[PDB]
From Swiss-Prot, chain E:
Disulfide bonds join 7-18. This is Spike protein S2'. Subunit of the fusion protein that is processed upon entry into the host cell. Mediates fusion of the virion and cellular membranes by functioning as a class I viral fusion protein. Contains a viral fusion peptide that is unmasked after S2 cleavage. This cleavage can occur at the cell membrane by host TMPRSS2 or during endocytosis by host CSTL. In either case, this triggers an extensive and irreversible conformational change that leads to fusion of the viral envelope with the cellular cytoplasmic membrane, releasing viral genomic RNA into the host cell cytoplasm. The chain holds residues 1026 to 1073 of 1273 of the full protein.
Length: 167, 223, 115, 97, 48
C-alpha cells in the first residue's frame, strides 16, 4: 500500500503526497497486475486437463511401480512421497501484505494427480480428447515405437525395464 | 465449424479481450501520462505559464525545477512501463511468428501447440494489432470397449502388428489402427514375427491368415 | 488493517455488492458474514455446491451472482470427476470423429507512440 | 476508484481498512519539581564570551510559557525544534549556555 | 506449460527438450511456487 508505506498514519504526509497526483495509484495497479498474472501462470501451467481423473484401486501396471509418485491417501493433503520431500526442502506491518494464491497446494496436488492418472492410464489420448484406457505395457510399446525402437524390445525385456524404472 | 466460429465472433465481444486489454493498457498509460501534468509537485501551480507570468527568475527557476523533476519522474516511469510492455508484446509476437511458421506453413506434431486435439492445419486472419489463428483439429468422438492383447501366437511364434493393435469384439480378433476403428483380418502382411510365445506377458492364441495358402488350394486341384 | 476489495457483477446486471476485508479476522470489522483465508467476506452467502470460478477471491474461493439472485461464495470446482475404466486387457479405440475449429488470438504490436 | 459510472464484473481493490483509535494515552514521569530556569535567565551576573557558563539541568518539568510570554527577548530563534511544541516533548538532558 | 503440454500430455521428439536421451514420457510433481518434472528417457548402454 503506497500511502501506508510512504505516509503511515499521517494526515499531513498524505496531503503532501497528494500533490504528486496519481503516482501512488499507478504503483498499486502494476503490483495488482503482477498478482493477477502469477495466478494466470499457475492456471496455465496446471489446469491443462478438463477432468479430474483417478487411478483404479488395483495397481496392475505390468510391474511398473508408481506408489512414489501417486498421492498418499493417509496424508491430510493427498500428496505423493516425492511431493512431500520437495515441500520440506524449500523454505511486515508497514502496509506490506502477502496475498494468498487462488489455487491452494491441495488443488495443485489434485491437478498433478489428475494429470498423472490420465497419463498412466491413457497415454496421450486424454490430452488429445476423451481418455482412452490403455494397458501400460502397450502404452510403453507406443512410446518405444515413438523413438524408432520396435516393440518386440519392450515385451521381451519388460521385467528389465520395470526393474530399471523402479531403481 | 466455420459457421460456428462466425457466430461466436459475432456474438461474444470478450473473445478479442486479449487485444482489447493491450489497447486499454496503452490508453491507461497515455491517460496517466497526460494527467500527470496536472500535479503541482510542491510548486505554487501546475501551469508553467502561470508560474512564468507571476514570478521573476529567482523564484521561477526553483518552481520550474520542481515541475521538471516531477514531469521527468513521470516520463521515466512511463517509458519504463512502455519498455516492459513492449518486451512482453515482443514475446507474444515471437510466439505468434513461431505458431505461423510451424502451424500454417506446415503441420505441427507438438501437442496443444495448435489448439486442442490432433492438429491438421491452420488459417491466418488479420486482427487490430494482432493475429487470429483458426486451428483445424482432429478430435475423436464416439468410442467402444474392446478386449486386447500385445501379441498373438500362431505356430509358437509371437506376432506383433506392423501398424495398429490387436483388438477383439468377443468372438474374433482383429487389428485396427490406433486413432480409428477399422477391423481387418490378421494376416502376415499386417504383422511381423519376433521371438516365441514364452516371453511376452499376455499373448493369446489365434491363427494368422497367410495370403499364399489359397493359391495353393488351387494347386492341389492343379496336381 | 487490511485491503478492502469489492466483489460485484456488472452494473447493468445488478447493483448488489459483496465486500472482502483482506487479511483480517471477522471481529474488528464494524448477517451473511463468512470467513476465508483471504480475509473476512461480508455480503456473500456460503454455498456447499461447487461451480466454475467467475470472480476469484483467494484460497480456492470464488464468487458468482446466481439464484431471487444474490452473490454467493463457494469452493472452486476443478472439473467433473471422471474415473477411467482401466484394465490390463481393455482398450478404448474410437469409431467416429469430429473436425473442430478453435480460435487462438495473439497480440502482435501496440500503438507506435512517440513523446 | 475506476473513475467511471459503469463497473465491469470482477473484484476491485478500492480502499483500505483501518481501526481508528478510541482515546489518547499521555504518559510522563510523575515528577513535580520546579525547574531552575529562573536562576539561569534572571542571574545578576552573566559569564564572559570565552568563559561561557554551562548549566546541566535535569529532573524537572518545563512549561516554557514564561519564555514564550516574555517580550523582553529581542531575538528568539529555534532551529532543531519548533518553539511552540516544546512542552509536549520529554528530553534526556538540556544545557543552558 | 509448454513442457507439460508437449511432454506429459504427449511424447516429445525434440532433442533435450525433456531431458538427456530419447524421451519417452514424463511425470508432473508439485513444488513450492514451481513444478518438478520426472522425465523418463531411453539411453543406450552397451555397444559393439
Ligand atoms: C512399490 O514400492 C514401494 C516402496 O517404494 C513398496 O512398498 C513397500 O512394500 C514392502 C512390502 O514388500 C514394505 O515392507 C515396505 O515398507 C513398503 N515401503 C513403502 C515406502 O511403502 C510397494 O510394495 C511396491 N509396489 C509394487 C507393486 O511393487
Ligand atoms: C465379431 O466380428 C465377426 C466378424 O464380423 C463376426 O462374425 C460374423 O458375424 C456375422 C453375424 O453378424 C455373420 O453373418 C458372419 O458370418 C460372421 N463371420 C465370421 C467370419 O464368423 C462376429 O459375429 C462378431 N462377434 C460379436 C460378438 O460381435
Ligand atoms: C495356446 O495354445 C498352446 C498350444 O498351441 C497352449 O500350450 C499348451 O499348454 C498346456 C499347459 O502348459 C500344455 O499342457 C499343452 O501341451 C500345450 N500345448 C501344446 C500343443 O504343447 C497354450 O497354453 C495356449 N495358451 C493360452 C493362453 O490359451
Ligand atoms: C459419425 O458422426 C457423424 C456426426 O458427427 C454422423 O453424421 C450424422 O449421421 C446421421 C445419421 O445417423 C445424420 O442424420 C446426420 O445428418 C449426420 N451429420 C452430419 C453432420 O452429416 C455419422 O453418421 C457418424 N458415423 C458413424 C460411422 O458413426
Ligand atoms: C467401457 O466399460 C466401462 C465399465 O466401467 C464403462 O464405464 C464405459 O462406459 C465403457 N465404454 C464404452 C465406450 O461403452
Ligand atoms: C490381467 O488381470 C487379471 C486380473 O483381473 C489377471 O487374472 C490376469 O492374469 C492379468 N493378465 C496379465 C497379462 O497381466
Ligand atoms: C446489461 O444488462 C441489460 C439489462 O439490464 C442489458 O439490456 C444489456 O444488454 C446488458 N449489457 C451487456 C453488454 O451485458
Ligand atoms: C479469529 O479469531 C478467533 C478467536 O476469536 C480464532 O479462533 C480464529 O482462528 C481467527 N481467525 C483468523 C482468520 O485469524
Ligand atoms: C454444508 O453441509 C453441511 C452438512 O453436511 C452443513 O452442516 C453445512 O452448514 C453446509 N454448509 C452450507 C454453506 O450450506
Ligand atoms: C525573571 O523575572 C521576571 C520578573 O522580573 C519574570 O517575569 C520572568 O519570568 C523571570 N524569568 C524566569 C526564567 O523565570
Ligand atoms: C571399436 O574400435 C575402436 C578402435 O579404436 C575402439 O577404441 C572401441 O572401443 C571399439 N568399440 C567397442 C564397443 O569395442
Amino acid at each position: 500500500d503506497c500511502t501506508m508505506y510512504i505516509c503511515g498514519d499521517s494526515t499531513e504526509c498524505s496531503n503532501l503526497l497528494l500533490q504528486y497526483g496519481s503516482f501512488c495509484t499507478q504503483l498499486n495497479r502494476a503490483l495488482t497486475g503482477i498478482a493477477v498474472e502469477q495466478d494466470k501462470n499457475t492456471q496455465e501451467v496446471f489446469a491443462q486437463v478438463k477432468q479430474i481423473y483417478k487411478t483404479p484401486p488395483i495397481k496392475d501396471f505390468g510391474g511398473f511401480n508408481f506408489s512414489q509418485i501417486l498421492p498418499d491417501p493417509s496424508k491430510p493433503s493427498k500428496r505423493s512421497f516425492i511431493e512431500d520431500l520437495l515441500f520440506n526442502k524449500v523454505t511486515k506491518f508497514n502496509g506490506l501484505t502477502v496475498l494468498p494464491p487462488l489455487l491452494t497446494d491441495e488443488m495443485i496436488a489434485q491437478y498433478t494427480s489428475a494429470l498423472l492418472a490420465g497419463t498412466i492410464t491413457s497415454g496421450w489420448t486424454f490430452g488429445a480428447g476423451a481418455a482412452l484406457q490403455i494397458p501400460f505395457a502397450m502404452q510403453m510399446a507406443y512410446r518405444f515405437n515413438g523413438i524408432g525402437v520396435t516393440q518386440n524390445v519392450l515385451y521381451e525385456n519388460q521385467k528389465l525395464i520395470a526393474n530399471q524404472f523402479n531403481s | 465449424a466455420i459457421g460456428k466460429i462466425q457466430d461466436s465472433l459475432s456474438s461474444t465481444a470478450s473473445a478479442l479481450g486479449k487485444l482489447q486489454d493491450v489497447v486499454n493498457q496503452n490508453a491507461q498509460a497515455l491517460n496517466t501520462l497526460v494527467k500527470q501534468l496536472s500535479s503541482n509537485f510542491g510548486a505554487i501551480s501546475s501551469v508553467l505559464n502561470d508560474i512564468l507570468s507571476r514570478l521573476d527568475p529567482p523564484e521561477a527557476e526553483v518552481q520550474i525545477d520542481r515541475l521538471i523533476t516531477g514531469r521527468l519522474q513521470s516520463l521515466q516511469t512511463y517509458v519504463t512501463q512502455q519498455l516492459i510492455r513492449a518486451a512482453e508484446i515482443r514475446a507474444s509476437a515471437n510466439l505468434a511468428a513461431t505458431k505461423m511458421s510451424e502451424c500454417v506453413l506446415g503441420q505441427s506434431k507438438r501437442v496443444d501447440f495448435c489448439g486442442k486435439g490432433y492438429h491438421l492445419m491452420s488459417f491466418p486472419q488479420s486482427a487490430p494489432h494482432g493475429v487470429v489463428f483458426l486451428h483445424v483439429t482432429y478430435v475423436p468422438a464416439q468410442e467402444k470397449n474392446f478386449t486386447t492383447a500385445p501379441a498373438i501366437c500362431h505356430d509358437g511364434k509371437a506376432h506383433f502388428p506392423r501398424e495398429g493393435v490387436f483388438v477383439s469384439n468377443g468372438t474374433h480378433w482383429f487389428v485396427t489402427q490406433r486413432n480409428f476403428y477399422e477391423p481387418q483380418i490378421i494376416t502376415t502382411d499386417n504383422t511381423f514375427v519376433s521371438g516365441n510365445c514364452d516371453v511376452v506377458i499376455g499373448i493369446v492364441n489365434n491363427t494368422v491368415y497367410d495370403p499364399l495358402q489359397p493359391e495353393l488350394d488351387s494347386f492341389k486341384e492343379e496336381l | 488493517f487490511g485491503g478492502v476489495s469489492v466483489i460485484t457483477p456488472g452494473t447493468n446486471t445488478s447493483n448488489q455488492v459483496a465486500v472482502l476485508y483482506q487479511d483480517v479476522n471477522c471481529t474488528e470489522v464494524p448477517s451473511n458474514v463468512f470467513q476465508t483465508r483471504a480475509g473476512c467476506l461480508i455480503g456473500a452467502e456460503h454455498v456447499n455446491n461447487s461451480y466454475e470460478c467467475d470472480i476469484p477471491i483467494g484460497a480456492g474461493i470464488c464468487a458468482s451472482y446466481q439464484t431471487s439472485q444474490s452473490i454467493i461464495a463457494y469452493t472452486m470446482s476443478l472439473g467433473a470427476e471422471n474415473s477411467v475404466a482401466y484394465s490390463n486387457n481393455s482398450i478404448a479405440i474410437p469409431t467416429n470423429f469430429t473436425i473442430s475449429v478453435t480460435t487462438e488470438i495473439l497480440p502482435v504490436s501496440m500503438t507506435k507512440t512517440s513523446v | 476508484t475506476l473513475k467511471s459510472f459503469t463497473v465491469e464484473k470482477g473484484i476491485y481493490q478500492t480502499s483500505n481498512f483501518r481501526v481508528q483509535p478510541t482515546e489518547s494515552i499521555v504518559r510522563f514521569p510523575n515528577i513535580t519539581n520546579l525547574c531552575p530556569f529562573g536562576e539561569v535567565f534572571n542571574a545578576t551576573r552573566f559569564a564572559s564570551v570565552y568563559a561561557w557558563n554551562r548549566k546541566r539541568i535535569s529532573n524537572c518539568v518545563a512549561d516554557y510559557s514564561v519564555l514564550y510570554n516574555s517580550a523582553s527577548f529581542s531575538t528568539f530563534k529555534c532551529y532543531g525544534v519548533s518553539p511552540t511544541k516544546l512542552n509536549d516533548l520529554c528530553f534526556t538532558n538540556v544545557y543552558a549556555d
